[PDB]
């Protein structure tokens, strides 16, 4: 599971997730999954979708993961009242906006990568599409 | 493939020996024996044949021992 | 008959039919493949 090796601070505010995305292109491989919805992607969903698409192409070709879960999420333990500080860090997410390319491939036929990206997209909570490389 | 030719030569007898024994309908009355033949493969046939070959060759070797005055 | 929220053709002989406001699949080869959306 992807996770920062070392961090400056242990916890982060909640924040918001407004706006569109930077990184809306296929700049490494030939095909990719572009996100159409907005939300969070955890480290267990990124890892589960990478296993599904690696196992679909029989490890022929290259795969680029193009997002990283760098934001910590905390939860209070069970049956405690409010307050008394902040919770404990439980997992890490990546914030997703309409337009991000999440994965890449190169070195497979265009027809086989659509099937591989279809099995991958069934593991994520965000609606995605299939995109190709452009000249400009 | 250093000694795969011996494996193929062993293949080239049970490749048609097995037919009259798979459907002979004497070893199928009990449930276990049919799948025993299917999975445990072809042990009895080729092992008995190779035993007969060993017996023939050992019979050959035993002879030609009572002779003198020659190297 | 399998009653699942997503019904798909599983073999070459499966057919989609809408009968009385219900989507359902029928095929002539494997009766295991008949299925309706419920």
């Amino acid at each position: 599971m992807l996770q920062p090796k070392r961090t400056k601070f242990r916890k982060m505010h909640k924040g918001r997730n407004r706006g569109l995305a930077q990184g809306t292109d296929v700049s490494f491989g030939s095909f990719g999954l572009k996100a159409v919805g907005r939300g969070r992607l955890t480290a267990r969903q990124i890892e589960a979708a990478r296993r599904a698409m690696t196992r679909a192409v029989k490890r022929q070709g290259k795969i680029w993961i193009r997002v990283f879960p760098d934001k910590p999420i905390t939860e209070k333990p069970l049956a405690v009242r409010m307050g008394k500080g902040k919770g404990n860090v439980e997992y890490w997410v990546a914030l997703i906006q309409p337009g991000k390319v999440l994965y890449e491939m190169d070195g497979v036929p265009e027809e086989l990568a659509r099937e591989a990206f279809k099995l991958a997209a069934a593991k994520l909570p965000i609606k995605t599409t299939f995109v190709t490389k452009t000249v400009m | 493939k250093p000694s795969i030719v011996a494996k193929l030569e062993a293949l080239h007898e049970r490749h048609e020996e097995v037919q009259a024994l798979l459907g002979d309908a004497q070893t199928i009355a009990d449930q276990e024996r049919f799948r025993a033949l299917s999975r445990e493969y072809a042990q009895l046939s080729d092992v008995s044949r190779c035993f007969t070959d060993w017996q023939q060759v050992q019979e050959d070797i035993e002879t030609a021992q009572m002779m003198l005055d020659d190297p | 008959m399998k009653v699942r929220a997503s019904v798909k053709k599983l073999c070459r002989n499966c057919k989609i039919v809408k009968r009385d406001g219900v989507i359902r699949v029928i095929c002539s080869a494997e009766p295991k493949h008949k299925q309706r959306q419920g």
């Binding site: - | 493939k1 795969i4 030719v5 080239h12 007898e13 490749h15 048609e16 020996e17 097995v18 037919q19 009259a20 024994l21 459907g23 002979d24 046939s45 044949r49 | -």
Partner: protein, 141 residues
């Protein structure tokens, strides 16, 4: 031409009649006789070679009698006694098993070309050599 009724084109290396478990169970449970291969098989085998697998027809009728006809050895087993290699393919692109002279095959093509189709002998050469190339054999100029 007559349709296949109960018969197949295959048997063990024809080297001897050997009406034994190597040959009989192919059709013994189908009727007729098994030990009939004792004299019926070396009649045509005594002069060809001792160890060549050649298919024969086993056309059998309800009269508990069967007619059999011999033929040329198949393509793969042919490239064993004169090709100088007793192995086969399994990774043609990974490696070459060895060298083979092309002039060898068309010298023995008309051995197999008697029933083999083709416009002429040279046409058969590419067919017989192509599956030879699949074995990893290097076609020597």
């Amino acid at each position: 031409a007559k349709k296949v009724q109960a018969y197949v084109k295959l048997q063990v290396a024809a080297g001897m009649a050997n009406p034994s478990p190597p040959v009989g169970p192919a059709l013994g449970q189908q009727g007729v006789n098994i030990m009939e291969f004792c004299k019926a098989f070396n009649a045509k085998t005594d002069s060809i070679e001792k160890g060549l697998p050649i298919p024969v027809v086993i056309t059998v009728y309800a009269d508990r009698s069967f007619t059999f006809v011999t033929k040329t050895p198949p393509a793969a087993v042919l490239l064993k006694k004169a090709a100088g290699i007793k192995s086969g393919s399994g990774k043609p692109n990974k490696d070459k098993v060895g060298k083979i002279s092309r002039a060898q095959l068309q010298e023995i093509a008309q051995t197999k070309a008697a029933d083999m189709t083709g416009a002429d002998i040279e046409a058969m050469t590419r067919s017989i050599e192509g599956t030879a190339r699949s074995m990893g054999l290097v076609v020597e100029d």
